[PDB]
Ligand binder design. Structure first.
Ligand SMILES: CS(=O)(=O)c1cc(NCc2ccc(CN3C[C@H](O)[C@@H](O)[C@H](O)[C@H]3CO)cc2)cc(-c2cccnn2)c1
Length: 763
């Protein structure tokens, strides 16, 4: 509770706007937010097309991301913008002090690349907004007529932040000067500020708000007889008339010719003295040193990746993953009808659920907040539930207390029933990027509970001030068990929810098995998809059917029970721990009785026939290995040995680049969208690698096959991801098993970053 508050104060500020190139906000719903924009201007019409704000990936952008980041200290981002002929650095740094979550500073540096005209004009904007009823923010006017020769100071106050100043410094670089008539009314060229107000809920729409002000400037030109007989230069036509004041939006605009840089200094008044540029430089150099020392300790890359090339690779994958951390706030869109069609209980259920959806009873609810890492800045800058379990495995190593914060944040979303939506789209900003037909969440939709994996790691670590704070929840056992105590009931609630909502049907068919209880079927499947399982288009029983059972789902339930055993045991929930033991024992038996195929040598999902009998449906691939991947099989199990055969078999799963999602022998190989029907995916490869290492560092019959497989798979996965990074600068979503090429989306940090932990090893 004391450590909680120090943790709160430490993590309050950051560049928690991963959906944009660079911006800051604190972990507060309605507060002070900033964002960077820039774009070259060569003509009277180009700036609207060159300006950058929200993250994307296309031919115009070579690459971007964090070179180093720790959300407690700050870091350095590099942006390589081809369209704008610019290489940009954004350094962000936090300075603890006072009562309001400390201070921070950022340096924005732009260097023209070799291709750029040496006299390029670049428009740079720093956009500042503040939400809240009783808060103030004011631009201190300049001494000069038309703008600022020097720094722009914003004075503001709020309940959340107390008093603060935000300074945008004069910076360094040529500022262009205009000889035109207009300069007599608009100045020759200088930094300008517009202070505006809009209703709070639209402050986020920085691009349109800016353009509306640019447009009003141009309309003013037109009305005041500035025309094509004698036009002012483009960059002056797009320079806002200076009008500072008070409001909830403040636009600070600069134009530079050539290279440039400028600082942003946020000074929390309740702290000591105010933040300077010399402070920024010192704290930046200091963060880099701490970052370095920590990486070497936490991510000690083992053979054969100890080389410096692999270190830089590892730093990039890690920094981008942990650098994705966002704070999201607002309403989510949920169908709360619990239409009976969603029980999916007859044949052809998918058509019924389509009928219910077509009622559109979904409503906004909340608001909610979420502090989480994300799969990708340009495409998926929001919380995804099973993804986050993978994101936190490397993050927890770095800073267990951060990871627990993020777990707590997710768990705080769980409704009364035990449901967390698998995709968290919080507020209009988060919604803007996401197509309407994809926003609505459904309380019957599960997603893998991979967050338990992180919990498991915490538990084993538990059994055996930024320095201190990162590890306080393990160094103080008292704190640990207390965290577990408070979360334990939500864990159980989620357990029970799986069993009530994702229940399969044994009792109503000719189905025999050790337990009449244990059987699971993901709700929400369509003819070609099962989105809730995480493996979108992995082939399942055709047609889908209320009788289906899914071996991945049962294995996840297995993961959960096992975690509940350890956590219950740590808390002495004896009555609970005994029930869990009966479920574990029953899932073990039932995985065999309902899922094992002796004929095929692997696990399979099941349905019920045209003739109403249990049928196995075997599609050799990730799904086939689940009981192994999820840690459920004994190290001497013959079944495990056969899965090891399947895994290593080059003609089924084993490619030089990692395990294929689907066997080359399956009829569904490389068909359709071919998402999970052949490509190599790091998250599942990671689970294989960890399980091989387990069977490998224990006496048993398969110790040495596992040792060989472990060695080679670790090598193949790391090298594929590394080679692609070296060539393209990106982490990719998935990798082509025939060519080794990364494909689908880029900037996937993202569970692809698991590679840093594969390299570092020692599970
Ligand atoms: C044409 S698109 O670029 O594919 C595309 C698609 C969709 N909607 C569906 C979708 C959602 C997430 C994933 C990735 N991935 C698939 C994995 O199978 C799951 O296991 C993972 O949990 C899941 C998360 O990592 C894939 C598909 C949204 C946007 C978008 C959203 C905001 C802003 N701009 N664009 C773009």
């Amino acid at each position: 509770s004391e450590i909680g508050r120090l943790n709160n104060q430490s993590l309050l500020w950051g560049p928690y706007r991963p959906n944009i190139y660079f911006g800051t906000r604190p972990r507060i719903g309605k507060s002070l937010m900033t964002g960077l924009m820039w774009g070259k201007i060569e003509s009277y019409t180009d700036f609207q097309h060159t300006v950058r704000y929200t993250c994307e990936q296309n031919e115009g952008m070579k690459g971007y991301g964090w070179d180093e980041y720790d959300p407690r200290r700050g870091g350095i981002q590099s942006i390589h913008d081809i369209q704008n002929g610019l290489d940009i650095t954004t350094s962000f740094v936090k300075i603890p002090g006072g009562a309001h979550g400390g201070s921070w500073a950022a340096r924005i540096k732009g260097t023209l690349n070799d291709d750029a005209p040496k006299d390029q004009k670049t428009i740079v904007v720093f956009y500042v907004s503040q939400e809240g009823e009783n808060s103030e923010l004011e631009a201190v006017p300049s001494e000069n007529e038309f703008g600022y020769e020097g720094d722009v100071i914003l004075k503001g106050r709020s309940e959340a932040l107390g008093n603060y100043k935000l300074v945008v410094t004069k910076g360094k670089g040529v500022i262009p000067q205009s000889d035109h008539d207009l300069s007599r009314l608009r100045g020759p060229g200088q930094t300008v500020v517009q202070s505006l107000t809009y209703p709070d809920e639209v402050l986020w729409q920085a691009k349109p708000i800016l353009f509306q002000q640019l447009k009003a400037g141009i309309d003013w030109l037109v009305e005041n007889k500035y025309d094509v007989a004698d036009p002012p230069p483009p960059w002056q036509v797009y320079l806002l008339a200076n009008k500072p004041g008070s409001g909830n939006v403040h636009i600070v605009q600069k134009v530079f010719e050539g290279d440039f840089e400028f600082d942003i200094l946020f000074s929390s008044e309740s702290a000591g003295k105010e933040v300077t540029s010399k402070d920024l430089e010192r704290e930046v150099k200091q963060a880099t040193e701490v970052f370095g020392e920590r990486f070497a300790r936490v991510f000690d890359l083992k053979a054969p990746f100890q080389g410096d090339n692999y270190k830089k690779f590892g730093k990039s994958m890690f920094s981008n993953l942990i650098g994705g951390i966002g704070y999201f706030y607002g309403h989510s869109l949920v169908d709360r009808s619990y239409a009976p069609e969603y029980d999916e209980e007859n044949e052809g259920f998918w058509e019924d659920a389509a009928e219910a959806r077509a009622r559109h009873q979904e409503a906004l609810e909340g608001p909610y907040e979420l502090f989480t890492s994300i799969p990708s800045r340009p495409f998926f800058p929001r919380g995804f539930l099973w993804d986050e379990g993978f994101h936190l495995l490397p993050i927890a190593d770095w800073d267990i207390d951060l990871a627990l914060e993020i777990i707590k944040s997710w768990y705080n979303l769980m409704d009364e029933d035990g449901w967390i939506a698998r995709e968290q789209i919080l507020g209009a900003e988060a919604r803007s990027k996401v197509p309407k037909e994809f926003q609505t969440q459904y309380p019957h939709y599960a997603n893998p509970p991979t967050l338990f994996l992180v919990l498991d790691n915490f538990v084993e670590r538990l059994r055996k001030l930024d320095e201190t704070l990162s590890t306080a929840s393990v160094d103080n056992p008292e704190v640990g068990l207390e965290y577990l105590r408070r979360l334990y009931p939500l864990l159980r609630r989620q357990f029970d929810w799986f069993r009530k909502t994702q229940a399969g049907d044994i009792k109503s068919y000719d189905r025999e098995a050790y337990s009449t209880k244990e059987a699971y079927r993901w709700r929400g499947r369509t003819v070609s998809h099962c989105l809730t399982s995480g493996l979108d288009d992995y082939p399942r029983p055709q047609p889908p059917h209320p009788g289906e059972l899914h071996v991945d789902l049962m294995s996840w339930v297995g993961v959960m029970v096992k975690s509940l055993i350890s956590i219950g045991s740590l808390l002495g929930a004896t009555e609970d721990v005994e029930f869990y033991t009966k479920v574990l024992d029953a899932i073990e038996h039932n995985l065999d009785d309902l899922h094992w195929s002796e004929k095929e040598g692997c696990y399979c999902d099941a349905t019920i026939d045209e003739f109403e009998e249990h049928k196995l449906v075997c599609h050799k691939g990730y799904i086939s290995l689940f009981p192994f991947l999820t840690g459920l099989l004994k190290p001497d199990s013959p079944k495990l040995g056969k899965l090891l055969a399947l895994i290593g078999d080059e003609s089924e799963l084993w490619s030089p680049y990692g395990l294929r999602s689907l066997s080359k022998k399956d009829e569904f190989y490389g068909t359709a969208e071919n998402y999970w029907r052949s490509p190599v995916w790091i998250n599942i490869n990671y689970l294989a690698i960890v399980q091989l290492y387990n069977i490998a560092t224990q006496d048993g019959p398969y110790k040495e096959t596992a040792r060989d497989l472990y060695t080679r798979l670790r090598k193949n996965i790391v090298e594929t991801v590394y080679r692609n990074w070296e060539e393209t600068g990106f982490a990719w979503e998935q990798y082509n098993p025939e060519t080794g090429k990364g494909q689908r989306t880029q900037h996937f940090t993202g569970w692809t970053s698991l590679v840093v932990k594969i390299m570092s090893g020692h599970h």
